[PDB]
Design a protein around this ligand. Structure first.
Ligand code: ATP
Ligand code: ATP
Ligand code: CFF
Ligand code: CA
Ligand code: CA
Ligand code: ZN
Ligand code: ZN
Lengths: 546, 241
């Protein structure tokens, strides 16, 4: 028992459907380093988000495919974390160390930038403008504490510095993940779907048309595992679409590849910086800039940098930075998501408000028009409804903001034949405008909040109901004490599947046994049969008493 | 302490009144519904303060002329000469006044900034008066509905699939009053408690084999004895119990 306890964290077990119809268990060794790195908190948050979106979108048909894709992305993040782990050559090594430090401390730089923005606005809270020179009004700092203006200038410069550092840090740690995901998706598309071979991508696919640049570039397999996807595509579609066409489209040289398959050479690379800058792929960098400019967070950070420079120019611009708390705090982000869940509804509701206000102005510009004077003095009357642009402006500026409608502003119609007419007009206006539309505005937000709360509740219950791999009622396992728990914890653990895949990739091909060889190649074929859907050893050997 | 403070100054006694929130139960439940989202409310009013500060920032440089509140022409009263006083005026008047701050701010007609200030007032009223109070309303309504749903699920759980076994009522229902009898006698929680008390009460030398087993195994903090998802009906269904 002792050695079993000692090796308990390192002993991994998985279950496969098998070549026959009997479920078979495979035992392997789990890397402790990989386990700890999987138990690092960023991966934990990433997998919480992954399972949240999988439960929210259902994805029952391709759930296993989603898990496999997540595992591949997580392995790429594993490689990233391994790279980030702790004259010309000196500056290059200092540059890479600085980039690694910014990648490690990207979040701290964001929090420091927020703190300095708050400090700058607190310094700006003391500014007084005096008409007299401290003849036009002169903004200045009215305070008794010395060197507050130099302190504000130093904080401005430091904040801009921090913003720059944040830009570089984000460019360091976030871009390679999106580039890897795009390259993997494009490789799958052009290998199995063939969106460029015997087919053309959709015009509405902006990224589909943007990815046509790196079709012939030699840097297409960069930042991605498979460096021969184009090779497989040629070996799969050359006899149909035309080998010359495939060759020109996907940029491989038959002579070069064949001579390297016979015997390749090892030429010396010139270490010149000029020839390195000439060997930098221009088209691949253009495509990378095109894909990175479509990202939301990169544009947000670039806007933050631009606003920092604007603040340095005019101090008042710094105020805008305050809005960064909506993304720095989480509850503010959730509430703003609840608000923007029904953004389409709100804009068309206020459009209906504008339409009905225009209809009221139309039906008021011909009748009750006399009751549109707002000048107390009798010598200079002030008609506010002589024409409809001014009458509509008056109505939408005053009647909406004023509680009770526009009747209060409009002249009392008593002693006049139009008394009842205008009374009804005001009643209808108040009831239809002030009440109903604001009721819709209230209900949309309340319904969005309730909708997201219900989404969280169903995500919780789904995450805790009928296992994951099998999707079978807990009751059966519950018959045995801690049955469902044990089933999900050991038999079909998602971390166990991930560890088994990682082990297969890590170990050599010559050391694989028959079952793991089968699983490895069959996985390479993108088929997911191995997953034992709705089956376990308890069911398989219930007669055998397992 | 408040009683002693009341003895000192009679006015302190007023504070004691608040004891009805804990003495009455419905007041405690409503105050729990209010405080269920206490974190949400304070950060919502913080967002209100932030957006009010942004409006004061964008008003201290433009529309500043329209900040006089003195009817008499001899002594003008600028309320937005600096931003601390201008922010204080905005957060004291525009929030409390229905319709925003545009009413307090001077009419911009006949001026180039007419449309500018009109848009400012519109945006202020819509973003401040409506949305944030809508969030305040929705948080309380959602907390009330949440606690009501919690009570409803507690009721149904307390009356569903027994307690000890956690097995569907239907099986027992097959026999009339089956589930009822099952929960009432077979696995009564009071019966478990009474059995434990009896084991503790009786001497160690008078214990039989089964109760000795249960007693010592209980001392070991293991809870196996609990018949999870099993009863004599299931065990002796062939034997017809
Ligand atoms: N086959 C399965 N393998 C693993 N977990 C499963 C499976 N089927 C369902 N689950 C559910 O997934 C849950 C994952 O564990 P849980 O969310 O409680 O961990 P955690 O402490 O939040 O993890 P972490 O700190 O890594 O984020 C299990 O508690 C279980 O309810
Ligand atoms: N194994 C179980 N033993 C006892 N009650 C169970 C069991 N499983 C479920 N229950 C539920 O617990 C309930 C407890 O009884 P109930 O709540 O109706 O009593 P009560 O009149 O409110 O009690 P009291 O006056 O002691 O508070 C049962 O009516 C039943 O629905
Ligand atoms: C090493 N390696 C693989 O072997 C692999 C993979 N994706 C699929 N496979 C097979 N990735 C991303 C990877 O890094
Ligand atoms: Ca071999
Ligand atoms: Ca004895
Ligand atoms: Zn399972
Ligand atoms: Zn029971």
């Amino acid at each position: 028992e002792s050695i079993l306890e000692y090796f308990r964290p390192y002993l991994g077990r998985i279950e496969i459907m098998g070549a026959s119809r009997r479920i078979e268990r495979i035992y392997f060794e789990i890397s402790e380093t990989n386990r700890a790195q999987w138990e690092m908190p960023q991966v934990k948050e990433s997998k919480r988000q992954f399972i949240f979106d999988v439960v929210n979108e259902g994805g029952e048909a391709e759930k296993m495919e989603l898990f496999v894709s997540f595992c591949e992305d997580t392995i790429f993040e594993m490689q990233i974390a391994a790279q980030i782990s702790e004259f010309w050559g000196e500056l290059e090594v200092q540059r890479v160390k600085f980039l690694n430090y910014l990648s490690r401390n990207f979040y701290t730089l964001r929090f420091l930038a927020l703190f300095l923005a708050f400090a700058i606005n607190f310094i700006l809270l003391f500014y007084k403008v005096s008409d007299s020179p401290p003849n036009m009004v002169y903004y200045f700092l009215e305070e008794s504490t010395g060197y507050m203006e130099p302190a504000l200038w130093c904080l401005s410069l430091l904040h801009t510095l921090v913003a720059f550092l944040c830009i570089i840090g984000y460019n360091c740690l976030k871009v390679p993940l999106v580039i890897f995901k795009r390259e993997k998706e494009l490789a799958r598309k052009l290998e199995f779907d063939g969106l460029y071979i015997t087919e053309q991508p959709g015009d509405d696919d902006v990224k589909g048309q943007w990815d046509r640049l790196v079709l012939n570039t030699p840097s297409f397999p960069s930042n991605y595992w498979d460096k021969f996807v184009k090779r497989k595509v040629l070996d799969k579609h050359g006899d149909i679409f035309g080998r010359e066409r495939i060759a020109e489209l996907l940029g491989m040289d038959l002579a070069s590849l064949e001579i390297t398959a016979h015997n390749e050479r090892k030429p010396d690379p010139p270490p010149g910086l000029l020839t390195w800058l000439m060997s930098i792929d221009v088209k691949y960098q253009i495509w990378k800039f095109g894909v990175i400019f479509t990202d939301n967070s990169f544009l947000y950070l670039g806007w933050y940098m631009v606003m920092s420079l604007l603040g340095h120019y005019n101090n008042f611009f710094f105020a805008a930075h305050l809005l960064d708390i909506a993304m720095g705090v989480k509850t503010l982000r959730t509430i703003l998501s609840s608000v923007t869940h029904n953004g389409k509804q709100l804009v068309m509701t206020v459009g209906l408000l504008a339409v009905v206000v225009y209809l009221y102005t139309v039906v008021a510009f011909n009748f009750f028009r006399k009751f549109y004077n707002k000048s107390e003095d009798e010598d200079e009357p002030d008609m506010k409804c002589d024409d409809m642009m001014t009458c509509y402006l008056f109505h939408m500026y005053v009647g909406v903001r004023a509680g009770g409608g526009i009747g209060d502003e409009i002249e009392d119609p008593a002693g006049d034949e139009y008394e009842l007419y205008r009374v009804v007009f005001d009643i209808t206006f108040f009831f239809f405008v002030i009440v109903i539309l604001l009721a819709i505005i209230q209900g949309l937000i309340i319904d969005a909040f309730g909708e997201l709360r219900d989404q969280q509740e169903q995500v919780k219950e789904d995450m805790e109901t009928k296992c994951f791999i099998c999707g079978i009622g807990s009751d059966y396992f519950d018959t045995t004490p801690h049955g469902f728990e044990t089933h999900t914890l050991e038999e079909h653990n998602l971390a166990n599947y991930m560890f088994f895949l990682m082990y297969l990739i890590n170990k050599d091909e010559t050391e694989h046994t028959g079952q793991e060889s089968y699983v490895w190649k069959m996985y390479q074929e993108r088929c997911w049969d191995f997953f034992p859907a709705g089956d376990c050893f308890r069911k398989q050997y219930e007669d055998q008493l397992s």
